[PDB]
Design a protein around this ligand. Structure first.
Ligand SMILES: [Mg+2]
Ligand SMILES: [Mg+2]
Ligand SMILES: [Mg+2]
Ligand SMILES: [Mg+2]
Ligand SMILES: [Mg+2]
Ligand SMILES: [Mg+2]
Ligand SMILES: [Mg+2]
Ligand SMILES: [Mg+2]
Ligand SMILES: [Mg+2]
Ligand SMILES: [Mg+2]
Ligand SMILES: [Mg+2]
Ligand SMILES: [Mg+2]
Ligand SMILES: [Mg+2]
Ligand SMILES: [Mg+2]
Ligand SMILES: [Mg+2]
Ligand SMILES: [Mg+2]
Ligand SMILES: [Mg+2]
Ligand SMILES: [Mg+2]
Ligand SMILES: [Mg+2]
Ligand SMILES: [Mg+2]
Ligand SMILES: [Mg+2]
Ligand SMILES: [Mg+2]
Ligand SMILES: [Mg+2]
Ligand SMILES: [Mg+2]
Ligand SMILES: [Mg+2]
Ligand SMILES: [Mg+2]
Ligand SMILES: [Mg+2]
Ligand SMILES: [Mg+2]
Ligand SMILES: [Mg+2]
Ligand SMILES: [Mg+2]
Ligand SMILES: [Mg+2]
Ligand SMILES: [Mg+2]
Ligand SMILES: [Mg+2]
Ligand SMILES: [Mg+2]
Ligand SMILES: [Mg+2]
Ligand SMILES: [Mg+2]
Ligand SMILES: [Mg+2]
Ligand SMILES: [Mg+2]
Ligand SMILES: [Mg+2]
Ligand SMILES: [Mg+2]
Ligand SMILES: [Mg+2]
Ligand SMILES: [Mg+2]
Ligand SMILES: [Mg+2]
Ligand SMILES: [Mg+2]
Ligand SMILES: [Mg+2]
Ligand SMILES: [Mg+2]
Ligand SMILES: [Mg+2]
Ligand SMILES: [Mg+2]
Ligand SMILES: [Mg+2]
Ligand SMILES: [Mg+2]
Ligand SMILES: [Mg+2]
Ligand SMILES: [Mg+2]
Ligand SMILES: [Mg+2]
Ligand SMILES: [Mg+2]
Ligand SMILES: [Mg+2]
Ligand SMILES: [Mg+2]
Ligand SMILES: [Mg+2]
Ligand SMILES: [Mg+2]
Ligand SMILES: [Mg+2]
Ligand SMILES: [Mg+2]
Ligand SMILES: [Mg+2]
Ligand SMILES: [Mg+2]
Ligand SMILES: [Mg+2]
Ligand SMILES: [Mg+2]
Ligand SMILES: [Mg+2]
Ligand SMILES: [Mg+2]
Ligand SMILES: [Mg+2]
Ligand SMILES: [Mg+2]
Ligand SMILES: [Mg+2]
Ligand SMILES: [Mg+2]
Ligand SMILES: [Mg+2]
Ligand SMILES: [Mg+2]
Ligand SMILES: [Mg+2]
Ligand SMILES: [Mg+2]
Ligand SMILES: [Mg+2]
Ligand SMILES: [Mg+2]
Ligand SMILES: [Mg+2]
Ligand SMILES: [Mg+2]
Ligand SMILES: [Mg+2]
Ligand SMILES: [Mg+2]
Ligand SMILES: [Mg+2]
Ligand SMILES: [Mg+2]
Ligand SMILES: [Mg+2]
Ligand SMILES: [Mg+2]
Ligand SMILES: [Mg+2]
Ligand SMILES: [Mg+2]
Ligand SMILES: [Mg+2]
Ligand SMILES: [Mg+2]
Ligand SMILES: [Mg+2]
Ligand SMILES: [Mg+2]
Ligand SMILES: [Zn+2]
Ligand SMILES: [Zn+2]
Lengths: 110, 45, 53, 77, 141, 181
RNA sequence: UCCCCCGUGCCCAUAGCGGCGUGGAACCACCCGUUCCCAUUCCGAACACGGAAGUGAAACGCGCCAGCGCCGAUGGUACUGGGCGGGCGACCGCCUGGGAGAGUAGGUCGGUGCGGGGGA
RNA sequence: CGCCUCCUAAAAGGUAACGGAGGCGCCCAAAGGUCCCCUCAGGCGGGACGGAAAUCCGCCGGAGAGCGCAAGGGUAGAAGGGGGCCUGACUGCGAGGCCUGCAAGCCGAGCAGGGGCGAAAGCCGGGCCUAGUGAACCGGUGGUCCCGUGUGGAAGGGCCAU
RNA sequence: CUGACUGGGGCCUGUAGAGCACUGAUAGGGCUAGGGGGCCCACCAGCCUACCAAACCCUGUCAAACUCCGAAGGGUCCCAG
């Protein structure tokens, strides 16, 4: 027995799995935000960034932009350019849109 | 709620026939009812 | 097909020529079908008309 | 004294054309199937009639994942 | 008699009576058992005789059990017509019995009548049979 | 959230008595009211009167919200019914309008019941919840004899966090449910 | 390089159901609220957003419980590739190769690959 | 009497009988492409009329639901249900394979023009798939502007799509 | 040297056989919607079923078109003969 949470996240991940681009894992909690880009073909998490580790304070909507600049800056140091953005099971809007804008404005081509 | 298509609620005074003042929030503020629990035979013993 | 489900020609409106032919149900769609389609004679997209085949 | 039976269609040659280890090419049909008995893996596609086919040059691969089913892959070289 | 009031399809193919019995080789119901020793097709009319003619031995009392069922229809073309033109017509439903299958079981009667009642039933079959007491080998399963 | 009589009376009157009697070990351990769904089972709206909105706006004024559409599951013979036919309505009741509808129901609706003999204590859901239904909407305060066009009732189902039907029974009786047995 | 949590994969129940017991400093969850962005074929339930007073009750995490479920040997047999005898036949045997299904013992209340922040 | 589905049909693919069973010659302007969202049948308790069963809640509930239509295969981790914008039910092509006696029918990534949608990744050459079909010959319709019996037209053909 | 044939590994299978978890079929039993029959009433119910029986439970059997299982074979690719 599963739930709509599983049935939703499994779908938005199954679609991204087939494309081949780098997949950005987005897990969201109440307090903080978490982001990581993973190559599932070889099955290993390459790099990750989170607001809990980045010690961010206030509104999550503007908090996502900074962590997007952080993860995008690390990926820019490694040489990563293109990426596919997974929105997770949650509705793509607001905080996830501003983190996605963190990776877009960070320089990644998507 | 859905704004525009739903009945909006405001402070409503509902006065029954027994005199018990009902402070609530209904579609109509000023409401008059005929019989309530304060004057109900089965409710009162 | 049928007498109701009829095939017809699609006439590009700006080149005066017909480029396609498809199906529609005249009981469910008695209106004249006007739908975008490509026209090599115009070398660009154009809205197409319903004309009798 | 008639037979209202006696009607049939012709078979469609359903099965695995290239087994695991065979030499395949881009466009060579891998498995002819109805529905999803086999599901595509790496470098394997699916047609409208559910037929599978390889995309690159490589080796055929059959890997059964249990509840996910049997999967076909291609190994480049 | 014993026949399905509802089936999925009308006729069933013949098959082959090879091999020993699938199951039912062990006495399962009664104090004594009647087991057929040869493979053949048995008809629910012959089995009907095995029931009626056996209650006619006790004339009252006892309890007779049934271990088989005629789940296989039997067909035959009309007489004086040629081959072809579809398969034959069903005149009755027959039962499939394999060697070693415990066909019947009797309980609620003495040893003498358990052998004597199943004897006539043994003579009502085209195939030979044997009466075996419910034995220690049976209830082990 | 606008404070109301039943809301205050639960925490200040119902909660302490439950805490005394059953002795709960946590604040979330105590029974909490989850949701109150309402199902208007018109049905006959499939027939001659195809639209039941005349009865829907009734619930819009009673609960303060417009009930949703409920379409038939599949084609059904004897009811002269087909798949996807709106023979009923449903509206879910929550944070504040639930307490409002509770005060209106208990204080006005339940009194107006014709020849009211009491409640049935055996209609519990078994998991600590309760469901019921009403016959004539004129019983409610928001409905008078003026604008009622036809006779229609409802089916009010409630959900609770309580586990035992005994705890649920003490909850209802402590909130003012007049059981007859 | 060791321990507790939370992301992400693998094998695809030895991993599930079910109950016993427990986890809040960190952390997650429910929770606090709905002006605001967003939102319900009605409902801030969900969906979404701003917060931090309360709480491990529920859920989740982690322990136990073989009740059910799951996986299940060995030994023999069914059956059979291939080589033979018999029976008037419906069919039956032995020689060599393979070898079940079920069923009986018994096993499992998971193991595992990387990334984070905490602890020795 | 052509076509599709299941069995015989002897676990690759293929296999006949005037053999055992059923269906097609339609239908779709959304039932299509994209994007977002949803999760059954059935069983257990309650509930106007109200019903074995209309409609909702709770608790149990990996598919027995529903996928136009027979049947099989498949499928809730959708392909299945609620709405939005849409025309790729594309043009010019096409690596190679399937099928295979021929003719034929099936699959198809991908490159270019021009386009839909998503934030993006991407996805769209109609439909969950297999039946819902007709080869040459003849003429029409619309376009193309290739031919024009000296010649310039024209007749009539050609090409294209139909 | 690629051929028939066979050896070693890999992949495909749903029949022999077996099995009832699915579609059907089943004898008996438990349990129990429900009718029929006898009592008990038109004014309503309570009562009993040496009774045909839904579902579910126990035991035991059926299948070309049934398959939770399942070979030997056969198939086909890759080295050597
Ligand atoms: Mg016609
Ligand atoms: Mg017609
Ligand atoms: Mg006509
Ligand atoms: Mg005509
Ligand atoms: Mg004749
Ligand atoms: Mg017929
Ligand atoms: Mg034919
Ligand atoms: Mg053919
Ligand atoms: Mg080849
Ligand atoms: Mg492998
Ligand atoms: Mg393996
Ligand atoms: Mg397994
Ligand atoms: Mg046979
Ligand atoms: Mg047989
Ligand atoms: Mg046995
Ligand atoms: Mg005759
Ligand atoms: Mg004659
Ligand atoms: Mg004795
Ligand atoms: Mg003696
Ligand atoms: Mg003795
Ligand atoms: Mg036993
Ligand atoms: Mg009428
Ligand atoms: Mg009508
Ligand atoms: Mg209708
Ligand atoms: Mg270290
Ligand atoms: Mg150290
Ligand atoms: Mg984890
Ligand atoms: Mg599982
Ligand atoms: Mg677990
Ligand atoms: Mg228990
Ligand atoms: Mg104890
Ligand atoms: Mg205890
Ligand atoms: Mg402290
Ligand atoms: Mg809820
Ligand atoms: Mg939430
Ligand atoms: Mg504020
Ligand atoms: Mg430990
Ligand atoms: Mg115990
Ligand atoms: Mg051999
Ligand atoms: Mg010899
Ligand atoms: Mg000799
Ligand atoms: Mg011989
Ligand atoms: Mg001889
Ligand atoms: Mg002979
Ligand atoms: Mg012998
Ligand atoms: Mg050999
Ligand atoms: Mg566990
Ligand atoms: Mg657990
Ligand atoms: Mg440290
Ligand atoms: Mg320590
Ligand atoms: Mg013929
Ligand atoms: Mg033909
Ligand atoms: Mg075959
Ligand atoms: Mg051939
Ligand atoms: Mg051949
Ligand atoms: Mg012939
Ligand atoms: Mg027909
Ligand atoms: Mg129940
Ligand atoms: Mg009636
Ligand atoms: Mg399942
Ligand atoms: Mg599952
Ligand atoms: Mg399945
Ligand atoms: Mg069932
Ligand atoms: Mg169907
Ligand atoms: Mg299936
Ligand atoms: Mg062209
Ligand atoms: Mg090339
Ligand atoms: Mg070739
Ligand atoms: Mg062909
Ligand atoms: Mg050839
Ligand atoms: Mg012309
Ligand atoms: Mg001119
Ligand atoms: Mg001309
Ligand atoms: Mg012409
Ligand atoms: Mg060689
Ligand atoms: Mg040859
Ligand atoms: Mg050969
Ligand atoms: Mg070997
Ligand atoms: Mg098959
Ligand atoms: Mg068989
Ligand atoms: Mg069983
Ligand atoms: Mg099936
Ligand atoms: Mg009774
Ligand atoms: Mg009784
Ligand atoms: Mg009886
Ligand atoms: Mg059982
Ligand atoms: Mg096994
Ligand atoms: Mg060959
Ligand atoms: Mg070949
Ligand atoms: Mg080679
Ligand atoms: Zn009053
Ligand atoms: Zn044009």
């Amino acid at each position: 027995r599963l739930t709509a949470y599983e049935r939703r996240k499994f779908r938005v991940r199954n679609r991204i799995k087939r494309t081949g681009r780098l997949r950005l894992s987005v897990f969201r909690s109440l307090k903080h935000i978490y982001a990581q880009i993973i190559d599932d073909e070889k099955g290993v998490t390459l790099v990750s960034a989170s607001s809990l580790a980045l010690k961010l304070k206030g509104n999550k909507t503007e908090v996502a932009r900074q962590v997007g600049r952080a993860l995008a800056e690390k990926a820019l140091a490694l040489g990563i350019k293109q990426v596919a953005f997974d929105r997770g099971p949650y509705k793509y809007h607001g905080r996830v849109k501003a983190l996605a804008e963190g990776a877009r404005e960070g320089g990644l081509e998507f | 709620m859905k704004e525009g298509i739903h009945p909006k609620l405001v402070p409503a005074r509902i006065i029954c026939g027994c005199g018990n003042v009902i402070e609530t929030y209904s579609t109509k503020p000023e409401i008059y009812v005929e019989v309530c629990s304060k004057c109900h035979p089965f409710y009162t013993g | 097909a049928s007498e109701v489900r009829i095939k017809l020609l699609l006439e590009c409106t700006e080149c005066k020529r017909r480029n396609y032919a498809t199906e529609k149900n005249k009981r469910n769609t008695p209106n004249k079908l006007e739908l975008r389609k490509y026209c090599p004679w115009c070398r660009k997209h154009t809205v197409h008309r319903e004309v009798k085949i | 004294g008639s037979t209202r039976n006696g009607r049939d269609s012709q078979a469609k040659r359903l099965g695995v054309k290239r087994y695991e280890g065979q030499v395949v090419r881009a466009g060579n049909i891998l498995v002819r199937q109805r529905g999803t008995r086999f599901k595509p893996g790496k470098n394997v596609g699916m047609g409208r009639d559910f037929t599978l086919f390889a995309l690159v040059d490589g080796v055929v691969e059959f890997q059964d994942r249990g509840r996910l089913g049997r999967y076909v892959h291609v190994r480049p070289l | 008699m014993l026949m399905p009031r509802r089936m999925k399809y009308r006729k069933q193919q013949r098959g082959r009576l090879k091999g020993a019995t699938k199951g039912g080789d062990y006495v399962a119901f009664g104090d004594y058992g009647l087991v057929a020793l040869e493979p053949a097709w048995i008809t629910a009319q012959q089995i009907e005789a095995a029931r009626v003619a056996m209650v006619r031995h006790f004339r009252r009392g006892g309890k007779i059990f049934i271990r088989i069922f005629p789940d296989k229809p039997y067909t035959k073309k009309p007489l004086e017509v040629r081959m072809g033109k579809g398969k034959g017509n069903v005149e009755g439903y027959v039962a499939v019995v394999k060697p070693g299958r415990v066909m019947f079981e009797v309980a609620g009667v003495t040893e003498e009548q358990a052998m004597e009642a199943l004897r006539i039933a043994g003579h009502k079959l085209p195939i030979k049979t044997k009466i075996v007491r419910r034995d220690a080998y049976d209830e082990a399963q | 959230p606008l404070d109301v009589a039943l809301k205050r009376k639960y925490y200040e009157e119902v909660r302490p008595e439950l805490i005394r009697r059953f002795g709960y070990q946590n604040v979330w351990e105590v029974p909490r009211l989850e949701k109150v769904v309402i199902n208007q089972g018109l049905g006959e709206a499939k027939e001659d009167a195809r639209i039941l909105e005349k009865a829907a706006q009734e619930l819009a004024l009673i609960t303060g919200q417009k009930p949703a559409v409920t379409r038939a599951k599949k084609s059904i013979s004897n009811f002269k019914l087909r798949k996807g036919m709106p023979i009923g309505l449903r509206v879910t009741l929550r944070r504040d309008r639930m307490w409002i509808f509770l005060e209106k129901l208990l204080n006005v609706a339940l009194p107006r019941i014709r020849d009211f003999r009491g409640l049935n204590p055996n209609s519990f859901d078994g998991r600590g919840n309760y469901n019921l239904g009403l016959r004539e909407q004129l019983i409610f305060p928001e409905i008078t004899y003026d604008m009622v066009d036809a006779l229609r009732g409802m089916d009010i189902a409630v959900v609770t966090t309580a586990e035992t039907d005994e705890e649920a029974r003490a909850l209802l009786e402590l909130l003012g449910f007049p059981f007859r047995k």
